[PDB]
Structure 1
Amino acid sequence: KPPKGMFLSQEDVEAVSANATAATTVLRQLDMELVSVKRQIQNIKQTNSALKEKLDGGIEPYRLPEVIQKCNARWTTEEQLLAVQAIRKYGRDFQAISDVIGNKSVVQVKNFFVNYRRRFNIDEVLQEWEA
C-alpha cells in the first residue's frame, strides 16, 4: 500500500541504501544518460531536416494525369499485342496488365489467358517471364 505517486520498490531502496553516495551516483548516471539521449535527438532531427530538404517539391513535377478510359469488350489486334507483352513483363499481376492495356477489366484479362492460350503460346511466355 504505497501512497499513489510515491515510488518505492525493495529494489530501488536497496540501490540508494548499500553505499554512502550510491544516492548521488545513481542520479548522475541518469543525468548523463539524459544528456546523451538529448544529443542523440539533435543528431537525428538535424539528419531528418536535411532529408526533408532533399524531398523539396514532392513528386508533383513527375505526376501523370488520370486517364479515365471507357472499358470495352471487343479485342483489337493492338490490344492483344499489348497483352502478350504485358504478360512477358509482368507475371499474372492481372491488375498491372489491365492498367497497361487501358480498357480491359481484370476479369477480361483473366479470360484472355484461357481464350488465347493456344494461339499466343502463353505457357511459353510465362516460362520466359520466370527465367
Structure 2
Amino acid sequence: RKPPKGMFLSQEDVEAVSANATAATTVLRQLDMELVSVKRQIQNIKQTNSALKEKLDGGIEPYRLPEVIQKCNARWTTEEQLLAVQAIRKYGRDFQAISDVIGNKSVVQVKNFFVNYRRRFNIDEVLQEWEAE
C-alpha cells in the first residue's frame, strides 16, 4: 500500500527518471548544480552579514541615557501645561509619548488634559496642524 519507510517512490518521480536513457543523470546533475548555486549564495550572504555585524560593534552603549523615574504627580503646573501643548503639536494623539515627555503625568491624566483644557488651549487647532506633518 505504501513504500518501505525510507524509500521515496512517487508516481511523479518515477516517470521523470525513466523518460529517456540519460534522464536519470540529467535530473541528478540539475540538483548538484542547484546545490552548488545555493551553497555559494550562502557564503555571499554569510559574508555580507559578517561585515554588517562589525558595523554594530559596541552596540549603542555610549548613547543610552540613564533611567529616571519620577513621582507621577497630579497638579498641572504652568510649566507642565506648556510642555503638553508642544507635545500635542509634535506627537498628536500619542499619549504614551506625551506622558513620557512631561514625565510626572499618567496616560489617563494626559487624556483628561485633552478634554479639560480643550477649550483654552485650542487643542483642535493644535491637532489639525500636527496632521499636516
TM-score range, shorter chain: over 0.9
Instruction: Measure how far apart 1:64 and its partner are.
Output: 0.8
Number of aligned residue pairs: 131
Which digits, 9 at most, give the CA deviation of each residue in 1:107-127, with x for residues without a partner? 111111111111111111111
**Aligned sequence identity (%):** 100
Q: Indicate the SS of the match to 1:61.
A: helix
Q: Report 1:18-97 matches (<5 A).
A: 18-97=19-98
Q: Indicate the SS of the match to 1:88.
A: helix
TM-score, normalised relative to structure 2 = 0.96
Distance in 2 separating the partners of 1:82 and 1:55: 35
4+ residue segments displaced more than 6 Å: none
Distance in 1 separating the partners of 2:119 and 2:13: 78
Instruction: Measure how far apart 1:18 and its partner are.
Output: 1.4
Instruction: Measure how far apart 1:128 and its partner are.
Output: 1.2
Instruction: Measure how far apart 1:26 and its partner are.
Output: 0.7
Q: CA RMSD in A?
A: 0.8
Aligned to 1:119: 120
TM-score, normalised relative to structure 1 = 0.97
